[PDB]
Amino acid sequence: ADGVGNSSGNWHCDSQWLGDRVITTSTRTWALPTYNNHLYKQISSQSGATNDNHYFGYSTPWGYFDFNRFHCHFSPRDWQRLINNNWGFRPKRLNFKLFNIQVK
Amino acid sequence: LMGGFGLKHPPPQIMIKNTPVPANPPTNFSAAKFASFITQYSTGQVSVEIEWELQKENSKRWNPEIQYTSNYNKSVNVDFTVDTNGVYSEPRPIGTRYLTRNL
Numbered sequence: 001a002d003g004v005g006n007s008s009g010n011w012h013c014d015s016q017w018l019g020d021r022v023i024t025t026s027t028r029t030w031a032l033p034t035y036n037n038h039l040y041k042q043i044s045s046q047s048g049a050t051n052d053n054h055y056f057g058y059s060t061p062w063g064y065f066d067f068n069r070f071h072c073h074f075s076p077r078d079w080q081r082l083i084n085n086n087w088g089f090r091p092k093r094l095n096f097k098l099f100n101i102q103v104k
Numbered sequence: 105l106m107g108g109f110g111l112k113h114p115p116p117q118i119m120i121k122n123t124p125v126p127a128n129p130p131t132n133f134s135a136a137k138f139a140s141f142i143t144q145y146s147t148g149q150v151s152v153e154i155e156w157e158l159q160k161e162n163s164k165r166w167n168p169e170i171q172y173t174s175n176y177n178k179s180v181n182v183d184f185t186v187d188t189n190g191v192y193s194e195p196r197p198i199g200t201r202y203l204t205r206n207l
Contacts, residue, residue: 075166076166076167076168077163077165077166077167077168077169079168080168080169080171084171
């Protein structure tokens, strides 16, 4: 809904402390390659792998986004504010965005 | 210059004394002042409540900041605590300047 010359988003990295809650936001730049030539391939453990290490599965051309580490969402100073002042925390809701996409 | 806030109208002085209670006067009038008083003292309870306004830290620095912390190493006495004899002590002169700000 923009076209070639209009940005589809802005960079929001800040953290916000309302004191009952904290809202942390992270914006990053990513690069997505073509994985295994647009192909679904089955993968499995080789011969000579021990019984414990055998596996069977599928690799896909798709990539995925993982924010599941804390330091993604918290700076070391924001982490300090949390751990020094608080007896506990839990996540409430999240919001995710992809924007300013470029295919080269 | 020792520190604190300068006030033109600081908190007022609260003054207290025990009212004199005379001992038994002579039975004939004497205009001399009484030097003879019933020995007494007073005890009681005193409450002080101050409301303090705070200025929160807005800093954007990435790295952590110096905090005032207790030491985790074991010790005979806990700091800022009574001893075995019931004596409260303060180990160090804690100051108020830890968080940082740009000029």
